Design a binder for this molecule. Structure first.
Ligand SMILES: O=C(O)c1cccc(-c2cc(C(=O)O)ncc2C(=O)O)c1
Ligand SMILES: O=C(O)c1cccc(-c2cc(C(=O)O)ncc2C(=O)O)c1
Ligand SMILES: O=C(O)c1cccc(-c2cc(C(=O)O)ncc2C(=O)O)c1
Lengths: 110, 110, 110
């Protein structure tokens, strides 16, 4: 799976090694091996979420695994909110998650 | 809606509070309440647009609202070009917009 | 076409003008004119790829040109791995490419 996290938290306000803890958490949450988990964190951005510029984060999750129902993703979403609220001291209303299906042909390795 | 703006303008060359003005503009343009508008600005990137490295910007707009016709989006596009040309002193040829449909199930809140 | 490259290489460790060489390479690889090629490089990010935080890069390629088969993209992928391995001194296992189809209506110019 492919995780992309944008935040207006400055790089020096983001916990050291967040990308490592999010990778291991994502493997456990999504039930995938760690060696197939990809995380990108882009801190220090200018962001407005739900109309406001308080600290926030946007998480994109892209995977062959993504099933196009709310319920299929709701347990995953709940875990990712719990992870990000504790790591970045964000309220529940300062995080949004977007899920994107992928197919095998779209992924280039070699 | 979800707005993502990449630019090669350095962070200190981007107008203070662009993310706030783009959020309010987007609400007015897309006819959505401000509290459902999300903006991310990523300045200081290395960018080539239409083959050149002059100042430029790429805007992604993702929404349940996006209708898969040029004409449905053309009035929106026109407004976003007018907004970005004036804020970032870019010519019309230095901006590209991409529209992406979303469905409700893809969005995780809580 | 639209190329987006994320890397954990610091901006000052990324070769000067990578965005220009990637633009010209992409035009030659994808068989498109340079003036329709768009490249974004976002360096200095925190990244884990295949579970690890060694230097890596993620390349997204979005185009009307993208055909939904592995084989249609495999020659393109091979060229982009060859380009990035030599520019960023990354091993083959430290790069992942994702291909995304676009339709004309999604692209706003003016
Ligand atoms: O399934 C494969 O063998 C394969 C081939 C290329 C890439 C991937 C892949 C897919 C996903 C995902 O969609 O969640 N995540 C990680 C990988 C990967 O192997 O890096 C998987
Ligand atoms: O429609 C809802 O109630 C709902 C639930 C979760 C997320 C969103 C949503 C959708 C969009 C959009 O697709 O343009 N924009 C903002 C939101 C949001 O409520 O944050 C809307
Ligand atoms: O085909 C067109 O005339 C046209 C109109 C608007 C945007 C684009 C376009 C499409 C792609 C692509 O999907 O690979 N790449 C570059 C462009 C562009 O003209 O900037 C093309």
């Amino acid at each position: 799976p492919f995780l992309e996290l944008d935040t207006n938290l400055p790089a020096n306000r983001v916990p050291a090694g967040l990308e490592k803890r999010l990778c291991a958490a994502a493997a456990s949450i999504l039930g995938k091996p760690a060696d197939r988990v990809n995380v990108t964190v882009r801190p220090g951005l200018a962001m407005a979420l739900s109309g406001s510029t308080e600290p926030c984060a946007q998480l994109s999750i892209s995977s062959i695994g993504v099933v196009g129902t709310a319920e299929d993703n709701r347990s995953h979403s709940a875990h990712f909110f719990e992870f990000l609220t504790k790591e970045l001291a964000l309220g529940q209303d300062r995080i949004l998650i977007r899920f994107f299906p992928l197919e095998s042909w779209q992924i280039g390795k070699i």
